[PDB]
């Protein structure tokens, strides 16, 4: 009875650890794609500033 | 193997971190939703740069300008107008629904303040009339579910084993005047306990053996050699210590 | 609870009736010591020493026959329930015969009705009626010390006229529905059924001799038939059976139902006859045999056959016993129908289908203990006597056997497999292979009274199995009236599989003990398997102060047998119990350590999962604030790329026409908010002015609170059952 | 059980033994020998939970099991909860003799 709970528990520690590590890598991919977007945007901000 | 206490500390310390592993999993599933939202707003951003890029090239065409008189609203100016229409209609309806709830609460205040001027006891009956309704809804769904099981058994889509079901109870009054009602309830109980009936037949004849099973046992037994099963004496007295 | 068992083992053998019967036997031994032998030779063999059962039980009382006074001594097995007095060692009742039995009684038998007892001797039968029960304790005549009991002599004139006739066997007819009928077998090879309504005239008579067509001669061949084994020795009834349809002619539509009476001869030929006391005698009760015993024996399965028992099972099992101590287990099966192929020349056109006996096994009983004499005496006389067989009222796969030198118990381990096979399907071949796995009958020597050759036996005089008041128990009473008591096991346990413990462990992830969780007894049943005896010592009757002191050499052989059985079947098996419980406990000692090491590891990951979650949230908000800054640069660019249009569109003017209207609706809407807020303020100030007299606290009684909690429990549990039932159908009806 | 999630599981074993007890019901067509044989199973089941030491974590529940088994020593340990000898008699009949007759009763009294 105690062993089944502690083994099912050990399996659900390792699940959340894997899912937390996945979110870190998905955040790192967003932060890089935000830099591609911010670096596509600046060339348009400059063109308007010359036209005003 | 251990003490009664060590085997109990293993249970309680298991259940205290099982509770945390749900708490921290729920934050891990919450943050994945907020990260999935942020990936969506990032693609709304990637679209916005191309929307702006194309818009900037169209603004240089000397043939475009003469068509602008008949242009619809832009899809943000129309959307802010659709939200202003939605908010105006909500602010219009919610003013009516707040006023109608406040008139309902005040008709019920006028009714309670009427009811007060002619004496006691409704508050006991709302409780029991709600328990009477709940127990009826329980009997209704139970009968509907049993008809669904009957239909699934008729269709050969559900085969079943066996299950059972519960019973009620009630407590007594205390304060001094119902003795004869319990004693009449016990006397009518005892009068309804009083004696029942009889039966007669021949004994059921024991089942015949299948003639095939009987012929199989004849032929099993006729071939078996039958060496005797002796009372076993110890097979060596020549291992005595004298 | 267990405690009430030991008290009766020590009380009952010390009860006053066993002292009276032990004092009387010392008062019968003073008068025949001395007259010297003068010359004459009696031309007679000695009488045949018959195996006695002068004891029975009823309802929770024991009944001992007392032939010194002609009574039953009746002694109670039910103590006064609770209260704290001891059971009186002095207390019993006497059931005195009205007319006394004019012969020596060797046996007593209670009727199927439990109202009538047969009193059975070599020259007669008398039948004693039980007096009525009443009073505080359900006692004979309300608790009298001596009660007179009505006695009837049966077949008296036929035993008092013909001096050479003797009784061989008797029983009650197996009917609870009819008047009590006895059945006799006498030394003329005739069976005689007598009614207690007409106790001197036989309601049915069955000649067992094939002697049709030759009348009108006398009487002296009785020597020579006996030498050849042509005397019927014993009989028993099988259960009520439907008569095979070939025995009556082709003109009866009803099924006829009769008792199958199995009859044993001294040559060991068995015969059958079907008997009813309810139907007309037309071809009922013809004799059928001899019954063929498969397989064919070359010794002929002995010529010393002496007892027979017909066990209540389907097919019938007939136990045949011999004076040599052999017991044969005959399964009774209907004969074959012969296929009409490939034989000419049998002369009689009347083959009645006769059933066949099939020997499953033979048992050989240790009637006196075998000791180690030297290899070289060809004339050591095997000790023989008449076996007596008894039915077990709580186990239909056990029976028991009394004899001059002891008591044996016999269980048939294969009976449950025979019932499993006959109850399986017509294609189930495997249940017949489970009948061919070698589990022999178990045989237990419970009591020994001839443990050494030099010792004279103590022949059993009383035998009864108590079913309901002591647990399933055995009572034995010696020829010396010593009372001996063994509690019987309630079950005929077959032997278990060979050792669930040559497992070498294998890891991956799950515990080997998940298989041993399914059955609750799994480890207890393993220890109960390793403890299991194949041989024991029997229980030994204490030697008498009148016996001859034995030659020392046989005491050493008896003790060398005894300590070896203890070393081989108890001590070794209890050291294997210990080595197994040691190995079991050590695995649990390490498994809990592993669980505390698993638990403390998950306790260390608790902190790390938190210290990661916090950083993931702080990293998400930094990515969210940055997306928001990029989107607020985007929205500003899309708004500068629209401000440079040189003329208003029609839709920019028709939006302005609509936007110029809304301020005058917003005035009326904001006024409607003010109106409703001043309505709320008014109602709330009006309610508040009413709060300054008390309300009476509605105290629900502590029984009415219980009522509502009990009902919310009933209805809460009914709702769980409906949710369970809907989920179980949703799991069973996948689409 | 609502207040104490450590005892609650064991309190509900005690509580469901307090639902399996064979008490006679006047509207119910059974024999005394049926009540008796069912109560003998219930007694052998209650004593089974005492051998497995099920209640040796709360001595109050260990006492309730002895009381429910007809333990005349544990019943006399409850004498400060038995205001008279005839309530002790009726308790002793409920937990030690449910097939008592008028013709036995003086001995118990």
Plain-language structure description:
This is part of a larger assembly, with chains A (52 residues), B (242 residues), C (735 residues) and D (109 residues). With 242 residues, chain B is mainly α. Chain B has helices at 6-58, 77-115, 123-154, 179-191, 211-223, and one strand at residues 229-230. Chain C has 12 helices and 32 strands. Chain C is elongated. Chain D contains 6 helices and no strands. Chains in contact: A-B, A-C, B-C, B-D, C-D. At the B-C interface, helix 1, helix 2, helix 3, helix 5 and strand 1 of B face strand 17, strand 23, strand 24, helix 9 and helix 10 of C. Chain B: Homodimer. Part of the nuclear pore complex (NPC). Interacts with NUP88. Interacts with ZFP36; this interaction increases upon lipopolysaccharide (LPS) stimulation. Interacts with DDX19. Interacts with XPO1. Interacts with XPO5. Chain B: The record marks 82-83 as: Breakpoint.
Major interchain interface with per-chain residue totals: B-C, 110 and 119 residues
**Number of DSSP-assigned strands of chain C:** 32
Please state how the strands of the largest beta sheet of chain C are arranged side by side: 1-2-3-4-10
> What's the assembly state of these chains?
part of a larger assembly
Secondary structure category of chain C: alpha+beta
Number of helical regions of chain C: 12
What gyration radius of chain C follows from the Cα positions, in whole Å? 44 Å
What is the structural class of chain D?
A: mainly alpha
Please describe the biggest sheet of chain C, giving its number of strands, its sense, and whether it closes into a barrel. Answer: 5 strands, mixed
- Major beta-sheet overview of chain D: none
Helix proportion of residues of chain D, in percent? Answer: 55-70%
The helix/strand series of chain D, from N terminus to C terminus, equals HHHHHH
Give a count of the beta strands of chain D, DSSP E runs of length 2 or more.
0
Strand content of chain C: 15-25%
Proportion of β residues of chain D? under 5%
- Report helical residue fraction of chain C: 25-40%
Modified residues (Phosphoserine) (chain D): 4
Organism (chain D): Homo sapiens
Family (chain D): Belongs to the nucleoporin Nup85 family.
Subcellular location (chain D): Nucleus, Nuclear pore complex; Chromosome, Centromere, Kinetochore; Cytoplasm, Cytoskeleton, Spindle; Cytoplasm
């Amino acid at each position: 009875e105690n062993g089944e709970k502690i083994t099912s528990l050990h399996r659900e520690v390792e699940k959340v650890k894997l899912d937390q590590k996945r979110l870190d890598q998905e955040l790192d991919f967003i932060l890089s794609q935000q830099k591609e977007l911010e670096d596509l945007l600046s060339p348009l901000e400059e063109l308007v500033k010359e036209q005003s | 193997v251990g003490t009664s206490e060590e085997m109990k500390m293993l249970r309680t310390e298991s259940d205290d971190l099982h509770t945390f592993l749900l708490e921290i999993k729920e934050t891990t599933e919450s943050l994945h939703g907020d990260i999935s939202s942020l990936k969506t707003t990032l693609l709304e951003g990637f679209a916005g740069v191309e929307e702006a890029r194309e818009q900037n090239e169209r603004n240089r065409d000397s043939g475009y300008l003469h068509l602008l008189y008949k242009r619809p609203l832009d899809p943000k100016s129309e959307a802010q107008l659709q939200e202003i229409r939605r908010l105006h209609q909500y602010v219009k309806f919610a003013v009516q629904d707040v006023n109608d709830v406040l008139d309902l609460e005040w008709d019920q205040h006028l009714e309670q303040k009427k009811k007060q001027r002619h004496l006691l006891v409704p508050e006991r009956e709302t409780l029991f009339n709600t328990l009477a309704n709940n127990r009826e809804i329980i009997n209704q769904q139970r009968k509907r579910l049993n008809h669904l099981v009957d239909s699934l058994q008729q269709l050969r889509l559900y085969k079943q084993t066996s299950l059972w079901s519960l019973s009620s109870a009630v407590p007594s009054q205390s304060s001094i005047h119902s003795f004869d009602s319990d004693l009449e309830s016990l006397c009518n109980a005892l009068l309804k306990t009083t004696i029942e009936s009889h039966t007669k037949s021949l004994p059921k004849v024991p089942a015949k053996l299948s003639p095939m099973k009987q012929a199989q046992l004849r032929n099993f037994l006729a071939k078996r050699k039958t060496p005797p099963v002796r009372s076993t004496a110890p097979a060596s007295l020549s291992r005595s210590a004298f | 609870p267990v405690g009430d068992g030991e008290l009766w083992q020590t009380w009952l053998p010390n009860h006053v009736v066993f002292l009276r019967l032990r004092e009387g036997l010392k008062n019968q031994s003073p008068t025949e010591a001395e007259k010297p032998a003068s010359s004459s030779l009696p031309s007679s063999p000695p009488p045949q020493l018959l195996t006695r059962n002068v004891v029975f039980g009823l309802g929770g009382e024991l009944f001992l026959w007392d032939g010194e006074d002609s009574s039953f001594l009746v002694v109670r097995l039910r103590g006064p329930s609770g209260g704290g007095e001891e059971p009186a060692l002095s207390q019993y009742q006497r059931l005195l015969c009205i007319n006394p039995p004019l012969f020596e009684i060797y046996q007593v038998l209670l009727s199927p009705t439990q109202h009538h007892v047969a009193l059975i001797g070599i020259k007669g039968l008398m039948v004693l009626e039980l007096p009525k029960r009443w009073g505080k304790n359900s006692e004979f005549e309300g608790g009298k010390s001596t009660v007179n009991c009505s006695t009837t002599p049966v077949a008296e004139r036929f035993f008092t006229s013909s001096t050479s006739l003797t009784l061989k066997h008797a029983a009650w007819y197996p009917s609870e529905i009819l008047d009590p009928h006895v059945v006799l077998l006498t030394s003329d090879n005739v069976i005689r059924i007598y009614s207690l309504r007409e106790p001197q005239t036989p309601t049915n008579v069955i000649i067992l001799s094939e002697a049709e067509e030759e009348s009108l001669v006398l009487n002296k061949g009785r020597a020579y038939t006996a030498s050849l084994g042509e005397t019927a020795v014993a009989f028993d009834f099988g259960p009520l059976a439907a008569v095979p349809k070939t025995l009556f002619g082709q003109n009866g539509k009803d099924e006829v139902v009769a008792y199958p009476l199995y009859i044993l001869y001294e040559n060991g030929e068995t015969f059958l006859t079907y008997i009813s006391l309810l139907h007309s005698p037309g071809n009922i009760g013809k004799l059928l045999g001899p019954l063929p015993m498969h397989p064919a024996a070359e010794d002929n399965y002995g010529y010393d056959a002496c007892a027979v028992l017909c066990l209540p099972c389907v097919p019938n099992i007939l136990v045949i016993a011999t004076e040599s101590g052999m017991l044969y287990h005959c399964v009774v099966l209907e004969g074959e129908e012969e296929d009409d192929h490939t034989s000419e020349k049998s002369w009689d056109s009347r083959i009645d289908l006769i059933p066949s006996l099939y020997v499953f096994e033979c048992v050989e009983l240790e009637l006196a203990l075998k000791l180690a004499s030297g290899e070289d005496d060809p004339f050591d006389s095997d000790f023989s006597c008449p076996v007596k067989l008894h039915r077990d009222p709580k186990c239909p796969s056990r029976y028991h056997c009394t004899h001059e030198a002891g008591v044996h118990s016999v269980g048939l381990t294969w009976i449950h497999k025979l019932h499993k096979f006959l109850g399986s399907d017509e294609e189930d071949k495997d249940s017949l292979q489970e009948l061919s796995t070698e589990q022999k009958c178990f045989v237990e020597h419970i009591l020994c009274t001839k443990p050494l050759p030099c010792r004279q036996p103590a022949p059993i005089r009383g035998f009864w199995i108590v079913p309901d008041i002591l647990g399933p128990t055995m009572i034995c009473i010696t020829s010396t009236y010593e009372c001996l008591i063994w509690p019987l096991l309630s079950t005929v346990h077959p032997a278990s599989p060979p050792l669930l413990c040559t497992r070498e462990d294998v890891e991956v992830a799950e515990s080997p003990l998940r298989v041993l969780a399914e059955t609750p007894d799994s480890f207890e049943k393993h220890i109960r398997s390793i403890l299991q005896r194949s041989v024991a010592n029997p229980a030994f009757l204490k030697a008498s102060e009148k016996d001859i002191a034995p030659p020392p050499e046989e005491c050493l052989q008896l003790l060398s047998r005894a300590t070896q059985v203890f070393r081989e079947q108890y001590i070794l098996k209890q050291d294997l119990a210990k080595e197994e419980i040691q190995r079991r406990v050590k695995l649990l000692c390490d498994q809990k350590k592993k669980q505390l090491e698993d638990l403390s590891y998950c306790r260390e990951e608790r902190k790390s999962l938190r210290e990661m979650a916090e950083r993931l949230a702080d990293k998400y908000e930094e990515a969210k604030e940055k997306q928001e800054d990029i989107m607020n640069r985007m929205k500003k660019l899309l708004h500068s790329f629209h401000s440079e249009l040189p003329v208003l569109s029609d839709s920019e003017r028709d939006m302005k026409k609509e936007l110029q209207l809304i301020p005058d609706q917003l005035r009326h809407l904001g006024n409607a908010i003010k109106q409703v807020t001043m309505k709320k303020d008014y109602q709330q100030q009006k309610m508040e002015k009413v709060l300054s007299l008390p309300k009476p606290t509605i105290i629900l009684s502590a029984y009415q609170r219980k009522c509502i909690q009990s009902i919310l429990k009933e209805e809460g549990e009914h709702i769980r059952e409906m949710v369970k039932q809907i989920n179980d159908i949703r799991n069973h009806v996948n689409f | 059980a609502d207040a104490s999630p450590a005892s609650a599981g064991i309190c509900r074993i005690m509580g469901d033994l307090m639902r399996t007890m064979p008490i006679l019901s006047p509207g119910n067509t059974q024999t005394l020998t049926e009540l008796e044989l069912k109560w003998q199973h219930w007694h052998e089941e209650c004593e089974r939970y005492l051998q497995d030491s099920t209640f040796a974590t709360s001595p109050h529940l260990e006492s309730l099991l002895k009381i429910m088994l007809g333990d005349e020593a544990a019943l006399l340990e409850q004498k400060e909860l038995l205001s008279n000898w005839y309530h002790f008699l009726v308790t002793r009949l409920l937990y030690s003799n449910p097939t008592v007759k008028p013709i036995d009763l003086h001995y118990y009294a």
